[PDB]
Amino acid sequence: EDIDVILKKSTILNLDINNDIISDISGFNSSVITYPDAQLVPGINGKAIHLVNNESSEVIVHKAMDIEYNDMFNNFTVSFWLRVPKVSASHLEQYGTNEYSIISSMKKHSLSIGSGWSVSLKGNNLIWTLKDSAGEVRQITFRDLPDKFNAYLANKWVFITITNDRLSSANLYINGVLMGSAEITGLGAIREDNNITLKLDRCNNNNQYVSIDKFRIFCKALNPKEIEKLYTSYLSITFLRDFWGNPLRYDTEYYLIPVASSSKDVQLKNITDYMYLTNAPSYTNGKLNIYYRRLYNGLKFIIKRYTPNNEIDSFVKSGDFIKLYVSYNNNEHIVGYPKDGNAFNNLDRILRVGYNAPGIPLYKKMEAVKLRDLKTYSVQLKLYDDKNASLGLVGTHNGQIGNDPNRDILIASNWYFNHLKDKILGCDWYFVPTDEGWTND
Ligand SMILES: OC[C@H]1O[C@@H](O[C@H]2[C@H](O)[C@@H](O)[C@H](O)O[C@@H]2CO)[C@H](O)[C@@H](O)[C@H]1O
C-alpha cells in the first residue's frame, strides 16, 4: 500500500553500477555480462552505461529462472534513464529512416520470429514494440518535440518508463509525463529470448552512441503515482547538475542560460562592469521540422572552490561555497559586488566582472544551491558579503545603467527567497558545457 514498498516489491531486475561493475541488485540475481566496449560515463546518480556502435559494446542480462516468462502474459513495466545525442540535420537526412534497437528481449539468431519487446530509435522517434508468438505486433511511436532545447532525445538525461497492462494498453512516459500509448489487447503469449540485450542493433551510423542508466523491470503496470515517485526517487538533491543532467563540476567552462528566459544568453558590458541578457541566435529547419536556440554563445563561466575542504571532489554539491569567474580573452575575472556599488532601489546589487578599484571591498563569496524545481537541471547562486550576510540570489533586474539601452542586468537580490514556490523564477540558471552530443547545425 506504500508506493516505495510496491516499487521495491515488484522489481524483478535492477541494474546498478558499483565499484565499476554492473550487476542486478533486484534480489533475483540475474547474471549480467559486460562486453569489452560497454563504457561507463557520468550518470544521474553515479555512473551510467555508454554504448557505442560496434559488436563489443553490449551488456547482456541472463534472466534468472524465476523471471523467465514474466512478460509472456502478465503485466510489466520497464524503466531506465536515457541520454541520446541531438541528431544533426545531416544525420536526420541520411539516417532518419533507420530504426535501430538499443534494448531488447527479442531473440534473432535461432528463430526468425523475434518475439518479445524492444526499445528502438528512428531519427527523432522513440519506439516501444511488443510482438507475440504469432508475430502480432503493437507499437508506441513517440515523435520528439521539434524544439530541441526542450526535446527528450536531444542530449539530456531523461527518464523513460513504459507500462504494459495486458487487459488494456501499453503507456510510454518520459519524466513521469504520458507521451504516447497503444491498446495491446489482442496480443497473445510473448515468447522472448532468455537474454535482455543492451546494444545498438541495426544502426547504420558508425558514430551513434546512447547512454542508459538504472535499467529496471517491474512485474506490474505502474500507475502514474508510482511512476512519479519512481522518477523523483532518482533526483538526489545533494549533487548539482549541468544542463545535460550530468554532475556540475568545478574548473570547467559553462555557458549560463536563465531558465526563466531560455532564449537569452549572458553578455558582458566591459571588464569591471556589468552583465546583461542578449537574444541567442537561432537555427530553424522547416523541411525537417527542427529548430532550437543555438548553444555556446555568450560568456563562459568557471566555478572555483572557495576553500579546500577535507577532500577534493570534482563535482559541486549544494551548499558548497564557490567563487564564480568569467573567462574572457583567456583571462579569468571574478564576479562579485563592490561594497556600496551601484544597485537598484530595492537593493538588487549589480554584479561586476573583474572589478578592481583600489581599496574597495569586492564581495565574491557565493554558495551553489538547489532550493527549487527538483526536476529541472538548474542551480541557484547565493552571494554573501564579507560578514556572511546574504546579498541575495543571482538573477536579473530590468532597467538602465547610465545612458545604456534598457537591459535585463545581472544582480543579486534577496527578493527571490520569498518566491521559491513559483513555477518559473528568475534566479534559476542552467550551466551548459560544450558537449559532443550537441553541435549547432
Ligand atoms: O529583485 C529582483 C526581482 O524583482 C522582481 O520584482 C519585484 C521587485 O524586486 C520589488 O522591489 C517590487 O516591490 O516587486 C517586484 C515584483 O513585481 C521581479 O519580478 C523579478 O523578475 C526580479 O527582477
UniProtKB/Swiss-Prot annotation:
Disulfide bonds join C203-C219. This is Tetanus toxin heavy chain. The chain holds residues 875 to 1315 of 1315 of the full protein.
